Amino acid sequence: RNRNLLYEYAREGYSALPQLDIERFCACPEEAAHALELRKGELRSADLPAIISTWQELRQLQEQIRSLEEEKAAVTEAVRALLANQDEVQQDPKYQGLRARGREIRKELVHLYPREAQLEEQFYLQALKLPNQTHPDVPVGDESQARVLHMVGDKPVFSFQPRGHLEIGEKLDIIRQKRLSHVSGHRSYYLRGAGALLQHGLVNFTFNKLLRRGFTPMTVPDLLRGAVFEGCGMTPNANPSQIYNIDPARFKDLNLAGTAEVGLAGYFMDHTVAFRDLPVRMVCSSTCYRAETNEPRGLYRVHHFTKVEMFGVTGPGLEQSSQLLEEFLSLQMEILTELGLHFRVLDMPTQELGLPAYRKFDIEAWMPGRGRFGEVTSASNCTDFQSRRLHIMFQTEAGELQFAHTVNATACAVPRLLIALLESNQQKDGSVLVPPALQSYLGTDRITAPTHVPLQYIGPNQP
Amino acid sequence: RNRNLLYEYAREGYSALPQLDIERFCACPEEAAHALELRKGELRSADLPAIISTWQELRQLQEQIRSLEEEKAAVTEAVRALLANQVQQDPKYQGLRARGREIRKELVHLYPREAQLEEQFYLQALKLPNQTHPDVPVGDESQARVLHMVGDKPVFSFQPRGHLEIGEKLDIIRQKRLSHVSGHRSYYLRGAGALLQHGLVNFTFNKLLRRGFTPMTVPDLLRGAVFEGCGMTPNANPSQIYNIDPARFKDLNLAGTAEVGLAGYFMDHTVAFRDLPVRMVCSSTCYRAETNTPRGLYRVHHFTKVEMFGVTGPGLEQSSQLLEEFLSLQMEILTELGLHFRVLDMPTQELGLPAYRKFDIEAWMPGRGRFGEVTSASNCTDFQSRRLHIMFQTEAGELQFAHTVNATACAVPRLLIALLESNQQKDGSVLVPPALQSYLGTDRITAPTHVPLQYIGPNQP
Numbered sequence: 004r005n006r007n008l009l010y011e012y013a014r015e016g017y018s019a020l021p022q023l024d025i026e027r028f029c030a031c032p033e034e035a036a037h038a039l040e041l042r043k044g045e046l047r048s049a050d051l052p053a054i055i056s057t058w059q060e061l062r063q064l065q066e067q068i069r070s071l072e073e074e075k076a077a078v079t080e081a082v083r084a085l086l087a088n089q090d091e092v093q094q095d096p097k098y099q100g101l102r103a104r105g106r107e108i109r110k111e112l113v114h115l116y117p118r119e120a121q122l123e124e125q126f127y128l129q130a131l132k133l134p135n136q137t138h139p140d141v142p143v144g145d146e147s148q149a150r151v152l153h154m155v156g157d158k159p160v161f162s163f164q165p166r167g168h169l170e171i172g173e174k175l176d177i178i179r180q181k182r183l184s185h186v187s188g189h190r191s192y193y194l195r196g197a198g199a200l201l202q203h204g205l206v207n208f209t210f211n212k213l214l215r216r217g218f219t220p221m222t223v224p225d226l227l228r229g230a231v232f233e234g235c236g237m238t239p240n241a242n243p244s245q246i247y248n249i250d251p252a253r254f255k256d257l258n259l260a261g262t263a264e265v266g267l268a269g270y271f272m273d274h275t276v277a278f279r280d281l282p283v284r285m286v287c288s289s290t291c292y293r294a295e296t297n298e299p300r301g302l303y304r305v306h307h308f309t310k311v312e313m314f315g316v317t318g319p320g321l322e323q324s325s326q327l328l329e330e331f332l333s334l335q336m337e338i339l340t341e342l343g344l345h346f347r348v349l350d351m352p353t354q355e356l357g358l359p360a361y362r363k364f365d366i367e368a369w370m371p372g373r374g375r376f377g378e379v380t381s382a383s384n385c386t387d388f389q390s391r392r393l394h395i396m397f398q399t400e401a402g403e404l405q406f407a408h409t410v411n412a413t414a415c416a417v418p419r420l421l422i423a424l425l426e427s428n429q430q431k432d433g434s435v436l437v438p439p440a441l442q443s444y445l446g447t448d449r450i451t452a453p454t455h456v457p458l459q460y461i462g463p464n465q466p
Numbered sequence: 467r468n469r470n471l472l473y474e475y476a477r478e479g480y481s482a483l484p485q486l487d488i489e490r491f492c493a494c495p496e497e498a499a500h501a502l503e504l505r506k507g508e509l510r511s512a513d514l515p516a517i518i519s520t521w522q523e524l525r526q527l528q529e530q531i532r533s534l535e536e537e538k539a540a541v542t543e544a545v546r547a548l549l550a551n552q553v554q555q556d557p558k559y560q561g562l563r564a565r566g567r568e569i570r571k572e573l574v575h576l577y578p579r580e581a582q583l584e585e586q587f588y589l590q591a592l593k594l595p596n597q598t599h600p601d602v603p604v605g606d607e608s609q610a611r612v613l614h615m616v617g618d619k620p621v622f623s624f625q626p627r628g629h630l631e632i633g634e635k636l637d638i639i640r641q642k643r644l645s646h647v648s649g650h651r652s653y654y655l656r657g658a659g660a661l662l663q664h665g666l667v668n669f670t671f672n673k674l675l676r677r678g679f680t681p682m683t684v685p686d687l688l689r690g691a692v693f694e695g696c697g698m699t700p701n702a703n704p705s706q707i708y709n710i711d712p713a714r715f716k717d718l719n720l721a722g723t724a725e726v727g728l729a730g731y732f733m734d735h736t737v738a739f740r741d742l743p744v745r746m747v748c749s750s751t752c753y754r755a756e757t758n759t760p761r762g763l764y765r766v767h768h769f770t771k772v773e774m775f776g777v778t779g780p781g782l783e784q785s786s787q788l789l790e791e792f793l794s795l796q797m798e799i800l801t802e803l804g805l806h807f808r809v810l811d812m813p814t815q816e817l818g819l820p821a822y823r824k825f826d827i828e829a830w831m832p833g834r835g836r837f838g839e840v841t842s843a844s845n846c847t848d849f850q851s852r853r854l855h856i857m858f859q860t861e862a863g864e865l866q867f868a869h870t871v872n873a874t875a876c877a878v879p880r881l882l883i884a885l886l887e888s889n890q891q892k893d894g895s896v897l898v899p900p901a902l903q904s905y906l907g908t909d910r911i912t913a914p915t916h917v918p919l920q921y922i923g924p925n926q927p
């Protein structure tokens with residue numbers, strides 16, 4: 004049921020126990036409670052007091068067990084000398100008393116050991132839900148409180164009232180989201196011709212730009228075990244799960260990934276990277292699956308999406324980690340400006356930061372048909388939260404293994420970008436202007452009506 | 467559950483009942499039984515007569531159902547006629563009403579028996595295979611026929627070394643300590659290996675686009691019936707189809723080819739004659755369970771594959787020409803990568819349920835020391851069209867069942883193995899084939915600047 008896979012991995016010896024910075028949080032209790040409330044996370048300040056109590060009791064049981072073991076191991080050596088040194092083997096009641104002391108402590112330990120396991124499991128489960136710290140400049144509050152740091156571009160001015168992405172696509176037969184209920188499901192999309200080329204072009208353009216800027220290219224397994232998701236700070240256990248799961252009966256611990264952050268993290272799990280290699284910048288393109296059951300219609304929310312992701316393992320300094328975030332943001336902003344898109348960079352507030360994020364920058368791009376700015380990219384400094392759980396480490400020249408910092412950002416979310424590109428570059432005739440960067444991949448300056456005859460329904464449902 | 471989703475679609479009224487070629491089986495039961503046996507599929511000669519018998523019981527029961535129904539209408543009309551001419555008093559009137567009640571009760575009992583027979587005939591019928599080209603060889607994979615052999619085995623001063631060793635040395639592939647992270651037969655490709663996959667897909671896609679293939683993007687999560695339509699069995703006990711938790715989500719299954727999605731696009735929809743032949747190219751992340759049906763990238767659960775699919779004109783020759791066109795494109799791609807490959811006509815046992823003809827290409831992989839399948843090309847004829855209602859409209863306007871052909875343009879895992887093993891060098895470097903040089907950016911893959919990751923884990927003692 005509600006079991007931390009990471010603790011279970013420690014239990015079977017698969018992985019070590021997650022390390023936590025609980026002592027620092029305990030050192031300032033009033034400050035700690037205030038921080039959590041700002042997060043408005045599942046564990047708000049109300050759930051906090053019980054964890055402190057669980058932690059305190061756990062320490063004591065260990066103390067007792069430690070003392071008992073020292074006494075228990077000691078007596079055996081002492082008796083060994085007595086039988087040989089006495090040279091009437093068991094007559095001295097001291098010999099008799101010593102055996103008795105061992106048995107009573109052994110009995111006490113046999114009772115004590117199960118209680119230690121139950122408590123260790125309990126404290127870790129509550130700790131697993133403990134949120135990351137918040138950067139001082141982070142705006143505090145709901146999405147509305149989020150700050151707008153930089154705005155680039157001007158809203159496209161249209162003579163006509165602009166049409167929506169799906170309408171333009173279906174008219175050009177480049178997007179199909181219709182008659183797909185009994186084949187692929189609700190919110191499922193097929194991209195045809197230019198739409199497919201547009202995705203391929205956007206992914207290839209972003210991949211090439213990042214590869215040139217020193218990103219190391221990688222391919223990630225798309226089916227991954229749940230412990231990794233918990234390590235990335237994603238919640239596999241929760242009821243409104245966005246994570247699709249392979250049938251447990253058929254296969255165990257296999258969960259589809261909604262990003263490549265999870266996969267890239269898996270590569271670094273339980274492994275160390277040399278300080279000299281750091282910083283580590285990596286780029287991956289993956290098919291991403293997210294349930295998102297939690298109601299609009301269109302490509303804005305969909306179950307399957309192809310996304311190019313930027314990930315990095317950075318050095319010890321929190322300041323060193325923050326630099327990567329700004330670099331990632333700069334690149335994110337550059338790709339969008341190069342695509343001719345109007346966008347605004349928002350420092351995210353505590354309520355939207357999420358459990359693993361010290362600071363998050365999200366970029367909203369103007370979509371004319373929606374008439375709204377919508378997240379097209381997310382950038383987050385996860386600091387050591389992910390490193391501590393999955394054991395991503397950096398080894399210094401000295402030989403020391405120390406926890407590393409993880410930064411994650413989105414280069415290309417094909418679904419939303421198509422909406423921005425199609426709606427913004429729309430023309431009254433219904434033609435869409437291929438932005439200059441992608442013109443090479445697409446092969447044209449305008450997406451024009453197709454030569455082909457579109458599919459027509461031959462099903463019984465037609466009325 | 468154990469239901470054939472296709473029948474349920476008809477039951478729920480979502481789609482029409484699958485049409486089928488069982489009539490040919492009934493016409494020549496002996497000939498069909500010999501053909502079914504040569505296939506060695508789920509069904510067997512002995513199974514066919516029961517299917518033939520089940521058809522007889524169903525059709526006869528339906529004919530009786532119509533006969534009684536005709537009578538019930540006759541009585542109602544005669545009763546209405548008596549009512550117009552004029553009541554309960556009339557002696558025959560009461561008789562007619564009672565006869566009507568009797569026919570109604572008899573129909574009510576007969577109705578369910580027909581439905582049970584329909585499901586039984588259909589579920590066994592859908593396990594019935596497509597026909598085979600006469601040229602198709604008969605027997606196991608041992609009895610394959612080699613249509614063509616291109617290239618020559620690479621010459622090596624050193625003993626050839628395997629892809630996994632070459633990969634780990636250059637840190638382009640990882641299959642180590644992934645058990646608690648992604649599973650066995652799971653792999654991570656890094657640097658040049660990622661570039662090689664990106665290049666192979668982009669190279670293959672580009673050639674196809676230039677030859678006029680239409681680009682497509684297929685939803686990875688698909689409902690089960692489409693798999694059944696393509697001739698794949700999700701209900702099988704040793705299923706190679708990964709299923710999302712049924713309790714959590716309904717009928718969402720992962721795809722092992724894009725064949726399924728592309729078929730869905732054409733399902734229960736019609737194409738115009740002018741468009742034919744319709745050629746589409748898709749790139750898909752393909753997932754396959756493969757429950758023992760050893761290591762390395764030869765058999766893996768996640769793979770990237772570019773698939774050529776086409777819906778052709780009415781003639782079988784129209785389908786066959788596309789198959790040869792598809793193999794031709796496949797052979798060219800392999801050659802342009804400087805690979806030694808053999809084209810094999812697959813025998814009946816290996817054809818598969820929806821296959822009229824299958825041509826597969828095996829490539830020379832030196833470290834293994836054996837040839838290996840990299841491509842499958844097949845003509846499914848009308849088997850898929852009949853099941854998923856993929857149809858074309860003639861100039862007059864008749865809607866008729868189409869023919870579908872499927873072929874693997876590029877399968878990244880096995881091809882990476884051969885290019886790496888075949889183009890290997892003693893220094894441990896691997897030479898980038900000229901076509902892929904632009905994408906990789908180098909003529910040879912050499913040792914990496916970075917330091918390989920080191921396990922900090924507990925399992926080490």
Ligand SMILES: Nc1ncnc2c1ncn2[C@@H]1O[C@H](COS(=O)(=O)NC(=O)[C@@H](N)CO)[C@@H](O)[C@H]1O
Binds near residue numbers: 261293310
């Ligand atoms: N259900 C969805 N439908 C469409 N696009 C989505 C969906 N979920 C996420 N995305 C896209 O993915 C972008 C980033 O996703 S995110 O979850 O916010 N953040 C991440 O994924 C980070 N792990 C880095 O990629 C969103 O801006 C949006 O562009």
Ligand SMILES: Nc1ncnc2c1ncn2[C@@H]1O[C@H](COS(=O)(=O)NC(=O)[C@@H](N)CO)[C@@H](O)[C@H]1O
Binds near residue numbers: 724763
């Ligand atoms: N488990 C696997 N591991 C690695 N490669 C695989 C695996 N399954 C299939 N492939 C690759 O995909 C190619 C085609 O596979 S196939 O099942 O024969 N044919 C199909 O996939 C058809 N659906 C057409 O694509 C194989 O030759 C091989 O190159």
